[PDB]
Amino acid sequence: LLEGKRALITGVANERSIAYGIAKSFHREGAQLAFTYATPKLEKRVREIAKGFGSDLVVKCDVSLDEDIKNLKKFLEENWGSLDIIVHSIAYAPKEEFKGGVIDTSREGFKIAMDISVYSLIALTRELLPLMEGRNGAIVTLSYYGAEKVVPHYNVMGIAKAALESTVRYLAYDIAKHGHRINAISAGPVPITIEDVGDTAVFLCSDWARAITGEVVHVDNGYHIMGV
Amino acid sequence: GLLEGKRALITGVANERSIAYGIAKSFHREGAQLAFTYATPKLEKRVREIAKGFGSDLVVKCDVSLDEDIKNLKKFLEENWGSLDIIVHSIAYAPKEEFKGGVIDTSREGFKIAMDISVYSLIALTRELLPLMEGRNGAIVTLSYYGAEKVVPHYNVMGIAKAALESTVRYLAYDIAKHGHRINAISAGPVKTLAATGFHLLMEHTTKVNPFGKPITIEDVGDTAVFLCSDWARAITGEVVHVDNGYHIMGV
Amino acid sequence: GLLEGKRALITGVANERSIAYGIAKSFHREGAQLAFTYATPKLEKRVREIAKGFGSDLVVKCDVSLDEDIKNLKKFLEENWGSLDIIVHSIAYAPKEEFKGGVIDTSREGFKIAMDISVYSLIALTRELLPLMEGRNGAIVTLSYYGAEKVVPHYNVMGIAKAALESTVRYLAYDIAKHGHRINAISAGPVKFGKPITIEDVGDTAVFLCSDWARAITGEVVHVDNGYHIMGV
Amino acid sequence: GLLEGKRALITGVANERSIAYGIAKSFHREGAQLAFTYATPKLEKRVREIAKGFGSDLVVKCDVSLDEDIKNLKKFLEENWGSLDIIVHSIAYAPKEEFKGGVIDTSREGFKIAMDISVYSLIALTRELLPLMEGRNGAIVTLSYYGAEKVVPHYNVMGIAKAALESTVRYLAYDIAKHGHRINAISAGPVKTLAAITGFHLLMEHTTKVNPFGKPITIEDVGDTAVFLCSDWARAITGEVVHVDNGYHIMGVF
């Protein structure tokens, strides 16, 4: 339960977004919410979604842009002045990258995949950590089994998610000095539901999970266990 | 109230410092009804007193080395509940001599005991009690330790047992899924318990190395156990969750 | 050749299709001298015949469930060789009943037997034979399977045993490194892309892992499985 | 030798302390014919002299950040060999500043460079050179580090890179298997190289104290493992990460 907690939600595009399921569970559990939208064409839907949860706090943020990350800090500084939770649900590679195999990955497509899907977590964490000072905050990100095993056609995203899980470990080391935690949910195809992810996110971002950091929790109906 | 209307069997309570006591405490807070085993006749008194403190009258002797004790446990729960939601498996033992040198010095008999009590008991309890869980959204949780994954000097045969335990969890998840049940492990960091050679140094080293510079508590385990045994974790099975203040991340 | 001047004990040969036979074959090719255990009297004839074909007359009965058989094996090696370089541990068993149903159906006695034969035997052999390896920089190799890591239906208690075995390899690596020795596991795919491997695949990997070329490798599990382990399907 | 009649491309030699030099040395002992890349014009002389020492006249400049250099590398190998058995990928870089604090302090540009040079280069080289391996039983080996799996302070963005690299190896194994080829990683322990950074001495000391042998690995340990992994003895081994680290990876206390 997240009473008194202020959470930033990234990655809401619509009502089927994994981040929507997280926001839904967070709202139920008493969290106040703020949202990013990735592009201008998503602003209307994200604003409506935020309003449906009683939030008017919506800000444009292209995570490939340093200036947008700094602007996000400023927006949160001005409207809240502190922060408890970051939900990082941002993953992208150009669609061409999923055709063929990893062997067919373009250099630019690789750069884009890593920057959006992995570096964005570092940039958000660095920039927003000051807002969390003295709060014992929590960050959660999303991964997939393709990080650990070959899922054909997942391609560069399997590489990105392996990098992401390592990033979670290093960031856990960094931010523990300031009292904060960061974990990943390795989600099955959304099969699980977005609500399965959301309820797991609530726990991991709650004080009940105070001893859990740098962990990857599989929310996948046990898919990960199978050897055949 | 995440466990409202849930019935949970708690194994492994010896005293108020036991990991299972932490689990009972969190489960109680969250609305679970509790039943307890005690391992040896000497523990009866304090386990009954502990149960009473949680509003439970259900305490029964169960030495998991004994097939008849497991059967009688089932009979006891059939009479007093007739359905079951949760099994907390917090049982680990090896003769103390097995911790003195290295794994190379493990005795055959000590090995057999360690695996039987620390691993096989999970299989026996799961098989025996599964019928009582029918129609329920059952959850089982067991306790492991990082010594399953890496070498922790003096943990020895228990590092072998815990690796077997985590594999056992995976196979059991596969078995019990078709009955609508889940099973997971909590890989807990060191806690100063009655149950837990070289402990002081292990505890000190772990505390120094983990990113928080502090040990976990039995309450940390309990709160994680609540989640994993609740319907919020309906999509989580065969998983090992580290409740260790980040110790598992370090490559120093 | 890679194993010249090295003396290797081979456990687990039952016949020419035994994984240990492939290891013995590769070991022989590479110049190792060989000694064999046989598990039961009814296997003596075939094992002696196999040993002879490799130019060995060093064959000894060893039921690894028996402490006295393990002590006796040390004596046999002390008498005939007086030193040792390599142990090949290829010993895994559970009563056939245990592979019916799932792990949930495992009997207590079947579990005890599986762990004792498949896992504890490695500890007992390593402890007992380590003195013979003194000052040689020895190497031990054991066998595992992907069912240690992931669920392979019907592998059951052996999946538990193999997970325990791999952990045992790590702890033993820690123990024996201070005496200059190494121990590793080969996680073999099913035996003769992600297709069945051969006993020769295992054998040539065993030679490397038990050679001085692998001097920096210990407590490792090497998958010899045509890449099966990578798949998330 | 185990590599008799095999032709191997060696990337990443800067001097005789380089991990790739150890690999070249073992490969040479074992009968491989060698070709070398050098990363920058300043390394040319050094790498040509090292190649000469192994009886090789095949050295070519290849900056892996450049698509045209990878294309020209292929053209060079087509002209001088026309077939290829082995690629040794020993390429890792991030700007020095990235090792100074924690991963939290990583710059966007330093991250991009690290991933491009340390990870993407493997994909580029594998894709470009695979045709030269057609009909051969090819093998590729790359170098990783335990920082891919666990937190090694100050290894930072390289620990992210190496985790991506190990995943890249798995996916490439899947891709190249249908052409009869294999690819593996050696997760090597610390070695004092030109390339190996903030806190190196302490990392080296700590690793040496903690590993069960109480000593670091050598470039020759890596070389001998690479020979096996790139030989037909390892025909059944692909997508694997092999720790060549004197047992460091087993330790759960430090």
Question: Residue D160 in contact with residue A167, Cβ under 8 Å?
Answer: yes
Cα torsion D2, D5, D11, D15 to 10°: value is: 70
Q: Which residues of B177-188 are buried (b: 16+ CB within 10 A; e: fewer)?
A: beeebbbbbbbb
- Kindly report the CA angle at D196 between D193 and D201, in degrees rounded to 5? 100
End-to-end CA distance of chain C: 40
Cα B190 to its chain centre, rounded Å, is 14
Q: In 3D, which of A113, A188, A141 has the Cα closest to residue A11?
A: A141
Contact A170, D151 (CB under 8 A): yes
How far lies D254's CA from each of B251, C169, C175, D203, in Å? 8, 19, 16, 12
Given strand D33-38, what is the order of strands in its sheet?
Answer: D59-61, D33-38, D7-10, D86-89, D139-144, D182-188, D241-244
N-term to C-term CA, chain D: 39
Q: Return the closest-CA partner of residue A150 out of D119, D171, C189, D122.
A: D171
CB pairs under 8 A between A and B: 86
- In total, chain C counts a number of residues equal to 233
Q: Cβ neighbours of residue A115 under 8 Å, at least 6 residues apart?
A: A64, D108, D111, D112
Contacts of D206 in chain B (CB under 8 A): 252
Contacts of C37 (CB under 8 A, 6+ apart): C9, C10, C11, C12, C13, C47, C59, C60, C61, C62, C73
Answer yes or no: are the C-beta atoms of C222 and C209 closer than 8 Å: yes
Integer angstrom CA distances of residue D246 from A206, C218, D223, D235: 41, 6, 14, 24
Structure tokens at B80: 């007093």
- B98 touches B114 (CB < 8 A): yes
**By three-state DSSP, how is residue D237 classified?**
coil
How far, in Å, CA of D235 to CA of A198, rounded? 45
In chain A, the DSSP E strands lie at: 6-9, 32-37, 58-60, 85-88, 138-143, 181-187, 216-219
Give whole-number Cα distances, C218 to A35, C174, D150, D229, in Å. 50, 9, 18, 16
What would the DSSP string read from start to end of D52-76? HHTT---EEE--TT-HHHHHHHHHH
CA distances from B123 to B172, C156, D169 (A): 8, 11, 37
Which one-letter DSSP state was computed for residue A224? G
- For tokens 């020769």, the residue is C200
Contact call for residues D252 and B149 (beta carbons, < 8 A): yes
In degrees and rounded to multiples of 5, residue B108 shows phi and psi of -55, -45
Handedness of CA C220, C226, C227, C229 (dihedral sign): negative
Who's near C191: CB < 8 A, 6+ residues apart? C17, C19, C197, C198, C199, C202
In whole angstroms, what is the distance from residue B205 CA to residue B215 CA?
10
Q: Residue D227 contacts by C-beta under 8 Å, 6 or more apart in sequence?
A: C213, D2, D3, D26, D27, D30
| Whether the Cβ atoms of residue B252 and residue D152 lie closer than 8 Å to each other | yes
- The length of chain D is 254
Are B19 and B143 within 8 A, CB to CB?
A: yes
Q: Rounded CA gap, C81 and C87, in Å?
A: 14
DSSP label of D231:
S
B9 membership: H or E segment, kind and range: strand B7-10
The CA distance from B212 to A181, in Å, is: 10
Other Cβ atoms within 10 Å of C17 Cβ, number:
10
Nearest CA in chain C to B155: C171
- Count structural domains, chain D: 1
Q: Nearest 10 degrees: CA dihedral of B223, B229, B232, B238?
A: 110
CA B11 – CA B9 distance, rounded (Å):
6
CB C205 within 8 A of CB C224: yes
Number of other residues whose CB lies within 10 A of the CB of residue D67: 12
Rounded to 5 degrees, φ, ψ at C197 are -95, 180
From the candidates D21, D145, D146, D248, give the one annotated as an active-site residue.
Answer: D145
For chain B, first and last CA: distance in Å?
Answer: 40
Q: C115 with A190: CB under 8 angstroms?
A: no
- What does the H/E/C string look like for B60-120? EECCCCCHHHHHHHHHHHHHHCCCCCEEEECCCCCCHHHHCCCHHHCCHHHHHHHHHHHHH
Helix, coil or strand: residue B210: coil
Catalytic residues of A: 144, 154
User: What residue has token string 């490969």?
Assistant: D27
Positive or negative, the Cα torsion across A13, A15, A16, A17? positive
- What lies within 8 Å, CB to CB, of B128 at 6+ separation is B70, B71, B73, B74
What is the rounded distance in angstroms from the CA atom of residue D132 to the CA atom of residue D135?
A: 9
Distance CA B89, CA B9 (A): 8
Strands (E), chain D: 7-10, 33-38, 59-61, 86-89, 139-144, 182-188, 241-244
Q: Which residues of B have a CB under 8 Å from any CB of C? A: 67, 102-106, 108, 111-112, 115-116, 119-120, 123-124, 126-127, 130, 148, 150-151, 153, 156, 159-164, 166-168, 170-176, 238
The neighbours of chain A, by the rule of 3 or more Cβ pairs under 8 Å, are B, C, D
In terms of Cα–Cα distance, which of A101, A217, A120 is closest to A163?
A: A120
CATH of the domain at A191: 3.40.50.720
Range D110-113, long-range pairs (CB < 8 A, 24+ positions): D110/D157, D111/A114, D111/A115, D111/A118, D111/A119, D111/A122, D111/D157, D111/D160, D112/A111, D112/A114, D112/A115, D112/A119, D113/D65
Instruction: Tell me how far apart the alpha carbons of residues B158 and B115 are, in angstroms, rounded to a whole number.
Output: 8
By Cβ distance, the residue of C151, C153, C232 closest to A149 is: C232
The answer to whether the beta carbons of residues A151 and D174 sit under 8 Å apart is: no
Distance CA C143, CA C209 (A): 12
d(CA D145, CA D244): 9
Tokens 């409207």 found at: A79
CB atoms within 10 A of CB C137: 12
- Is C145 part of the annotated catalytic residue set? yes
User: B1 burial class (0-12, 13-18, 19+ CB within 10 angstroms)?
Assistant: exposed
How far lies B86's CA from each of A223, B3, B10, B143, D174, in Å? 22, 10, 8, 14, 41
Q: Please identify which residue in the block is written with the tokens 């960050």.
A: A139
Method in brief: X-ray
Counting one residue from chain B and one from chain D, the pairs whose CB atoms sit within 8 A come to 37
Interface touch B120/C106, C-beta < 8 Å: yes
Cα separation, C201 vs C78, whole angstroms = 31
Phi, psi of C18 (to 5 degrees): -60, 140
Say yes or no for a CB contact (<8 Å) between A163 and D166. Answer: no
Distance CA D97, CA B185 (A): 40
The Cα–Cα gap between A115 and A99 comes to: 20
Quickly list H helices, chain B. 19-29, 44-53, 67-80, 108-115, 121-129, 157-177, 199-209, 218-228
Rg (CA), chain C: 17
Q: Is A9 exposed, middle or buried (0-12, 13-18, 19+ CB in 10 A)?
A: buried
Query: Is residue D207 a contact partner of residue D189, using CB atoms and an 8 Å limit?
Result: yes
Q: Which residues on neighbouring strands pair with residue C144, listed in sequence order?
A: C187
User: DSSP code of A71?
Assistant: H
Burial class (CB in 10 A: 0-12, 13-18, 19+), B15: middle
Span between the terminal Cα atoms of chain A, in Å: 38
CA distances (Å), origin C19, targets C62, C191, C227, D236: 18, 8, 19, 15
C33: its two tokens: 């001298």
Chain D residues with at least one Cβ partner in C under 8 Å: 170, 173-174, 177-178, 182, 189, 212-213, 217-218, 221-222, 224-225, 227-228, 233-240, 242-247, 249-251
Q: Which residue of A has its CA nearest to D107?
A: A123
Q: Measured between alpha carbons, how far is B142 from B165 in angstroms, rounded to an integer? A: 8
- The alpha-carbon gap from C21 to the nearest alpha carbon of chain D, in Å, equals 17
What is the amino acid identity at position C170? R
Q: Which tokens belong to D77? A: 């190998």
Give me the helix-helix angle, C108-115 and B108-115, nearest 10°.
130
The C-alpha atoms of residue A103 and residue A190 are separated, in whole angstroms, by: 27
Are the C-beta atoms of D216 and D246 separated by less than 8 Å? Answer: yes
d(CA D35, CA D11): 9
Q: What does the alpha-carbon distance between residue C84 and residue C77 come to, in Å, rounded to a whole number?
A: 8
Q: Are A43 and A17 in contact (CB under 8 A)?
A: no
Contact of D240 with C205, CB cutoff 8 Å: no
- CA–CA gap between residue B3 and residue B226 (Å, rounded): 7
Minimal Cα distance from B130: which residue of C?
C104
The tokens for D140 are: 């590729």
Residue-range definition of the domain harbouring residue A4:
1-228
CA atoms within 13 A on the CB side of D218: 10
User: What Rg value do the Cα atoms of chain D yield, rounded?
Assistant: 17
> Residue B33: in which H helix or E strand, if any?
strand B33-38
C120 Cβ contact partners less than 8 Å away, ≥ 6 residues apart: B106, B108, B111, B112
- Complete DSSP assignment for chain C: -TTTT-EEEE---SSTTSHHHHHHHHHHHTT-EEEEEESSGGGHHHHHHHHHHTT---EEE--TT-HHHHHHHHHHHHHHTS---EEEE------GGGGSS-GGG--HHHHHHHHIIIIIHHHHHHHHHGGGGTTS--EEEEEE-GGGTSB-TTTTHHHHHHHHHHHHHHHHHHHHHTTT-EEEEEEE--B-----B-HHHHHHHHHHHTSGGGTT--S-EEEESTTGGGB--
**What residue type is assigned to position C132 of the chain?**
L
Other beta carbons within 10 angstroms of residue D202's beta carbon come to: 11
Cα–Cα distance for residue pair D120/D124, rounded to 1 Å:
6
Candidates C149, C151, C232; nearest CB to A145: C232
